[PDB]
Amino acid sequence: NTALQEVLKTALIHDGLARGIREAAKALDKRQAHLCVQASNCDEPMYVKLVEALLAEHQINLIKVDDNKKLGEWVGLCKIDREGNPRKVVGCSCVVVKDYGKESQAKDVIEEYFKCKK
RNA sequence: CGGACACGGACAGGAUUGACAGAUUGAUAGCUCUUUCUCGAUUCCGUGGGUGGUGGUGCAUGGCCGUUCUUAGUUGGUGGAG
């Protein structure tokens, strides 16, 4: 439960993420891929059928979350503000991190990973 | 586009750059078409707005110069006409 809340959120700042209408399906073909995340409300589940054919066969590693209406202010464009509107952006279904570069609380994500999925 | 910014939408389930091969070209300008690969929020689209101008106006101006002016001319400060 700590893995869901705060320790994924310690390293998502400036790294090689996924952002844009060709990029998320572009940058997954790379062997720098550390821990990633998937929004589990994709309307056609055939896009995520492709990434599940991509993720488990090598060491790519997911966390399931709800959507992108709430991750829409997590990826890098925040629309709610003291002046921003409640609807400017929609986030992504699938972003990655290709190099951490910092070890702030980067253990509870990596401890969770070889904990339950062996 | 070398149209900064302000606002609204379109933007990760598909905005925007680049580009070989073939008509397309005056031309190795993907200019544009044909099929498709590619860059990664940078932007595009409309709406207000700066901008650039060897664009007009020397009869709106400045500065500079030229001339009447290449000759000896010019002017105040406190002094006559019951």
Curated annotation (Swiss-Prot):
Q: Which GO terms describe its biological process?
A: cytoplasmic translation; maintenance of translational fidelity; positive regulation of canonical Wnt signaling pathway; ribosomal small subunit biogenesis; translation
Q: Name any one GO molecular function.
A: RNA binding
The protein's matches in SUPFAM superfamilies, at most eight in alphabetical order, are given as: L30e-like
Q: Which residues carry this modification: N6-succinyllysine?
A: K115
InterPro entries cross-referenced by the UniProt entry: Ribosomal_eL30-like_sf (IPR029064), Ribosomal_eL8/eL30/eS12/Gad45 (IPR004038), Ribosomal_eS12 (IPR000530), Ribosomal_eS12_CS (IPR047860)
Gene Ontology CC terms: cytoplasm; cytosol; cytosolic ribosome; cytosolic small ribosomal subunit; Golgi apparatus; intracellular membrane-bounded organelle; membrane; nucleolus
Short name of any one Pfam family annotated for the protein: Ribosomal_L7Ae
First-listed, main subcellular location of the protein, grouped into a coarse class: cytoplasm
Q: Where located?
A: Cytoplasm; Nucleus, Nucleolus
- The domain of life for this entry's organism is Eukaryota
Q: Which UniProt keywords apply?
A: Acetylation, Cytoplasm, Nucleus, Ribonucleoprotein, Ribosomal protein
* Signal peptide bounds: none
Per the similarity annotation, which family is this? Belongs to the eukaryotic ribosomal protein eS12 family.
**How does this polypeptide assemble, per the annotation?**
Part of the small subunit (SSU) processome, composed of more than 70 proteins and the RNA chaperone small nucleolar RNA (snoRNA) U3. Subunit of the 40S ribosomal complex.
Q: Give the protein's biological function.
A: Part of the small subunit (SSU) processome, first precursor of the small eukaryotic ribosomal subunit. During the assembly of the SSU processome in the nucleolus, many ribosome biogenesis factors, an RNA chaperone and ribosomal proteins associate with the nascent pre-rRNA and work in concert to generate RNA folding, modifications, rearrangements and cleavage as well as targeted degradation of pre-ribosomal RNA by the RNA exosome. Subunit of the 40S ribosomal complex.
Output this protein's name.
Small ribosomal subunit protein eS12
